[PDB]
């Protein structure tokens, strides 16, 4: 299983006596076992791209051939760990060495083999039964949140010949044996899957269930759906932390994966430091987010192969849990840094560059990346379902949208949560641009909204119309000063402000506003839109002659109502239950309808 190094021209190592090798296979080059891949092959010689520094590699050094291509190790212990872009546990390397450096040629198994896991068989299978790919034959009890379901690896099937009894097993033991055409396969709790291969599903389903994030903005106006794909701009002043924390803390997804691609050391430190300190209430208990999260960490000085591979390592981990029936939400911290790593490799390989220097296949790689997300029907007899969402960020040099990476991304993602820095300077958070942002799932979710909430859809339509009109009136106001201006336009301007102030704006550092349940979000918007319509009617039905209603009159007449509308955000879901909040909102509806009635 060994070959020999023939020569080194830099980061590229030429091997000899390596006839038995496949392209994009893996090798461990030299006495330090440097990680690399075989790209060009000719005769019994192979050209190896080494990810790490090649200094010290000699002619005649051994090269160990590893049959599997770049692959991710999938099994118990994946959760709570921080991995390199090529699936190397950073929390074990730093703790098994007592060093601060990642050793050159470090060889730490992705999942530790010294843990005795609590494994319970399905109790439905027997020796002699038939099992197919994707079937679940037992569950490992990792923690209080996520059960780690052990699936038969894809592309495997047969009759069960051995089932391990209930007990404590580590990842090096044999749990299930199966025979296909006389060939017995011994399976442990860990499966290996090539990272560039898409894990099969029974069928790819439409995405219809909303992604219930905790923000009123980026939900009511710009919905995301489980299995959908969005893009988020990544600029220093955009306030991207709000989405990252809100998505990982309060989302209705089951498993969170955070993928770094190649960020600044201090930025990776902030993510690695913040995440372990985040908690959420679950069954009434406060649990660490890291019990249902996995994270891949890559800084700008990591091997370019890892920075390029990180994006595929993350989604492979995402699909792994997708096949368990979980809803998985993956965030790529910066897909632009990934594209930078990809362009670097194309340069290293002396490939012909295309648009703005990027590889000709940039679009194909991004398109096949996002196509892997979505709601699916899983493999295996359990007839379970799950989904993967992608909320990858883009950060092109200069902040422009002309960069092929951002242009290609926007043509692929169906939701764009355009953030802005001007809003941050004005201290308005979340910093959502509104006019640039869009969501293309509005129709896909129409069935859900009709079934459960009914009035949400006309409300979001009116809400966007009101906000857009405020923008359209901007020129009139600048040239007029609200003097030669319709009273109906004053309603639009001031109500649109009310929306921006006491609905779209949300203060996540307050205990009452940490999470806004959807029924509260639609309650808040319903009363604001109901007021809008009442105010429009109050003016329009009386605007003929003699005795007319104006906005100044409305403000003076029912100032208590405008206060009550602003106060609605303070209804703390932790203390005031669903019935109480709706009851108070119903009272505002009555107070309003009567207030306008007194004007006619």
């Amino acid at each position: 299983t060994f070959g020999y190094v023939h020569g080194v021209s830099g980061p590229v190592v030429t091997a000899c006596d390596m006839a038995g090798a496949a392209m994009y296979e893996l090798v461990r080059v030299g006495h330090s076992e440097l990680v690399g891949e075989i790209i060009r092959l000719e005769g019994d010689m192979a050209t190896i791209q080494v990810y790490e520094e090649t200094s010290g590699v000699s002619v005649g050094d051994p090269v160990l051939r590893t049959g599997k291509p770049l692959s991710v190790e999938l099994g118990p212990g994946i959760m709570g760990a921080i991995f390199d872009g090529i699936q190397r546990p950073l929390s074990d390397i730093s703790s098994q060495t007592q060093s601060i450096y990642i050793p050159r040629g470090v060889n730490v198994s992705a999942l530790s083999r010294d843990i005795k896991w609590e494994f319970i068989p399905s109790k439905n299978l027997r020796v002699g039964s038939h099992i197919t790919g994707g079937d679940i034959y037992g569950i490992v009890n990792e923690n209080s949140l996520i059960k780690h379901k052990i699936m038969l690896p894809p592309r495997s099937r047969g009759s069960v010949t051995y089932i391990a009894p209930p007990g404590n097993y580590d990842a090096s033991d044999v749990v299930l044996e199966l025979e296909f055409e006389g060939v017995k396969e011994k399976l442990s709790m860990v499966q290996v899957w090539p990272v560039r291969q898409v894990r099969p599903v029974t069928e790819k389903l439409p995405a219809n269930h909303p992604l219930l994030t905790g923000q009123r903005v980026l939900d009511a106006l710009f919905p995301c759906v489980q299995g959908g794909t969005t893009a988020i701009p990544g600029a220093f002043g955009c306030g991207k932390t709000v989405i990252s924390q809100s998505l990982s803390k309060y989302s209705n997804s089951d498993v969170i994966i955070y993928v770094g691609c190649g960020e600044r050391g201090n930025e990776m430190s902030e993510v690695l430091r913040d995440f372990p300190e985040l908690t959420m209430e679950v069954d009434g208990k406060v649990e660490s987010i890291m019990k249902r999260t996995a994270l891949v960490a890559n800084t700008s000085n990591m091997p370019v192969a890892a920075r390029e591979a990180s994006i595929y390592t993350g989604i492979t981990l995402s699909e792994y849990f997708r096949d368990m029936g979980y809803h998985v939400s993956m965030m790529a911290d910066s897909t632009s840094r990934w594209a930078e790593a990809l362009r670097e490799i194309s340069g290293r390989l002396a490939e012909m560059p295309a648009d703005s220097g990027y590889p000709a296949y940039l679009g194909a790689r991004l398109a096949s990346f996002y196509e892997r997300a979505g709601r699916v029907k899983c493999l295996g007899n359990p007839e379970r379902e799950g989904s993967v969402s992608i909320v990858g960020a883009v950060s092109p040099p200069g902040g422009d949208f002309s960069d092929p990476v951002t242009s290609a991304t926007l043509g692929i993602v169906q939701v764009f949560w355009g953030l802005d820095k001007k809003l941050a300077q004005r201290k308005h958070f979340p910093s959502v641009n509104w006019l640039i942002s869009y969501s293309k799932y509005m129709r896909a979710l129409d069935e859900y909204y009709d079934k459960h909430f009914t009035e949400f859809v006309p409300l979001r339509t009116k809400a966007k119309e009101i906000l857009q009109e405020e923008e359209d009136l901007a020129e009139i106001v600048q040239l007029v000063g609200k003097a030669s201006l319709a009273e109906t336009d004053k309603i639009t301007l001031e109500v649109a402000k009310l929306i921006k102030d006491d609905f779209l704006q949300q203060n996540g550092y307050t205990p009452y506003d940490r999470f806004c349940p959807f029924y509260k979000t639609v309650g808040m918007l319903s009363n604001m839109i109901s007021f809008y319509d009442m105010a429009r009617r109050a003016v329009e039905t009386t605007a003929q002659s003699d005795n007319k209603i104006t906005w100044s009159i409305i403000r003076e007449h029912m100032g208590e109502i405008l206060y009550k509308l602003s106060s609605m955000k303070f209804k703390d879901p932790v203390k005031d239950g669903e019935a109480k909040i709706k009851a108070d909102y119903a009272q505002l509806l009555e107070d309003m309808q009567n207030a306008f009635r007194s004007l006619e």
């Binding site: 021209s9 200094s55 010290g56 600044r264 800084t299 000085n301």
Partner: protein
């Protein structure tokens, strides 16, 4: 140790520009250091860049003139380039190759490190906290340097980027609300500037805490590539093994990038964007990211890379690829220089993303953040009023506009203008800030909370 006798070869297949191609070499390593002896007794250094079977190709550090293919001998060391490091080398001046040029002895090593080193495991990286004051108000009260960040100085050719760097070395230190060192490396520096740094550091007593590397413009271009690697190799030893805080200043990274392009050509690599190697991104990150804080140790490394903007275009790959992977920028302008303002640093386009963590109670003073934000707005407004003045005249301005104009004139004259030998600590810089802010009545200082104003504004 190896304890293996060295082999010396007289077998040379040919010589082609900077490269010497050897033959019949036994188990050669990549990046192995070798020594040449020419027929005239001259000794030269080189490094193996390619090993294709028995055909090792070595790049000679010095020029290849005079080398034949019959008598020149090549001694192999059996190892790669490893720099002798110690604490004692602090206070010494070295050339790019790591040799002393200060008439002192060769370094008596405490260890040997591979100058390429290893990446710092992100799991143990600590977010930057406290501040390292520089002594220059324009970059202490406006865009401070957190103890662990990496913030570049972009300059045009002809501006006093080297004089500012020298001033930082003389004045920089801890806040002081014995464990601070500076490692300073100049790449591609001309003889006149090399004298400037060496003499200015020695005369002002700063040398005790400075490790200076000078790679001259006429020195081997390959040595210019390891120079910043030796500087960081020293910084890593001093910072992480000897529990102290190291400020690393890398001067003229643009000259490094040019030397790197030459190395790429020596390898016969096809040039990438604007002639630079396709791997320039990772090469700069390899140097830049060897800094920051680490868990469980009290040391730290910060960097202030200094980069000349070709044609004064911030879009150029050198400042673009640098800034894309660094945290903010200082940004030295030209108009301020032509107006005879020193330092010529323009606060409006500068940014330090870590300033939020660098400053505040327990690190500098309670009002630090508030003074910075208000001064920035006042300067930006003063420039806006000055632009208006040029159109409407002085008589068309109101009282508030005149206050912003007065601020602009006194802000640049008192706060930004400093001189190369006045060391302004962070607390004096803030007090000077308040002297400028007290121009305005309380009601116009919109960005300073009332609690801060009541404590600091009067007197």
């Amino acid at each position: 140790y190896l304890s293996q006798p060295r082999l010396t070869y007289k077998t040379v297949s040919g010589v082609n520009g900077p490269l010497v191609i050897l033959d019949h070499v036994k188990f050669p390593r990549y990046a192995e250091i070798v020594h040449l002896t020419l027929p005239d007794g001259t000794k030269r250094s080189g490094q193996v860049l390619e090993v294709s079977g028995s055909k090792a190709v070595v790049q000679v550090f010095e020029g290849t003139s005079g080398i034949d293919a019959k008598k020149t001998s090549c001694e192999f060391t059996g190892d790669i380039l490893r720099t002798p490091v110690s604490e004692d080398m602090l206070g010494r001046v070295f050339n790019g190759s790591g040799k002393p040029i200060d008439r002192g002895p060769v370094v008596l090593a405490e260890d040997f490190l591979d100058i390429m080193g290893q990446p710092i495991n992100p799991q143990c990286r600590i977010y930057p906290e406290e501040m390292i004051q520089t002594g220059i108000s324009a970059i202490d009260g406006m865009n401070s340097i957190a103890r662990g960040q990496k913030i570049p100085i972009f300059s045009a050719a002809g501006l006093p980027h080297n004089e500012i760097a020298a001033q930082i070395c003389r004045q920089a230190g801890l806040v002081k609300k014995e464990n601070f060192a500076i490692v300073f490396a100049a790449m591609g520096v001309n003889m006149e500037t090399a004298r400037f740094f060496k003499s200015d550091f020695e005369e002002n007593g700063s040398m005790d805490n400075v490790c200076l590397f000078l790679n001259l413009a006429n020195d081997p271009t390959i040595e210019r590539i390891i120079t910043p690697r030796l500087a960081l190799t020293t910084a890593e030893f001093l910072a992480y093994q000897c529990e102290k805080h190291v400020l690393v200043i890398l001067t003229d990274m643009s000259s490094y990038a040019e030397a790197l392009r030459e190395v790429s050509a020596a390898r016969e690599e096809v040039p990438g964007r604007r002639g630079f190697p396709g791997y320039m991104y990772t090469d700069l990150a390899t140097i830049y990211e060897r800094a920051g804080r680490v868990e469980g140790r009290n040391g730290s490394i910060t960097q202030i890379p200094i980069l000349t903007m070709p044609n004064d275009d911030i879009t150029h790959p050198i400042p673009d690829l640098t800034g894309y992977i660094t945290e903010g920028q200082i940004y030295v302008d030209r108009q301020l220089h032509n107006r005879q303002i020193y330092p010529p640093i323009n606060v409006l386009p500068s940014l330090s993303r870590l300033m939020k963590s660098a400053i505040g109670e327990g690190m500098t003073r309670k009002d630090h953040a508030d003074v910075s934000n208000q001064l920035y707005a006042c300067y930006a407004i003063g420039k806006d009023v000055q632009a208006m003045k040029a159109v409407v005249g002085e008589e068309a301005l109101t009282s508030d506009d005149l206050l912003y104009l007065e601020f602009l004139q006194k802000f640049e004259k008192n706060f930004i203008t400093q001189g190369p030998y006045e060391n302004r600590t962070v607390y004096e810089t803030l007090d000077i800030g308040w002297q400028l802010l007290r121009i305005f009545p309380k009601e116009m200082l919109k960005r300073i909370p009332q609690s801060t104003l009541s404590e600091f504004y009067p007197r």
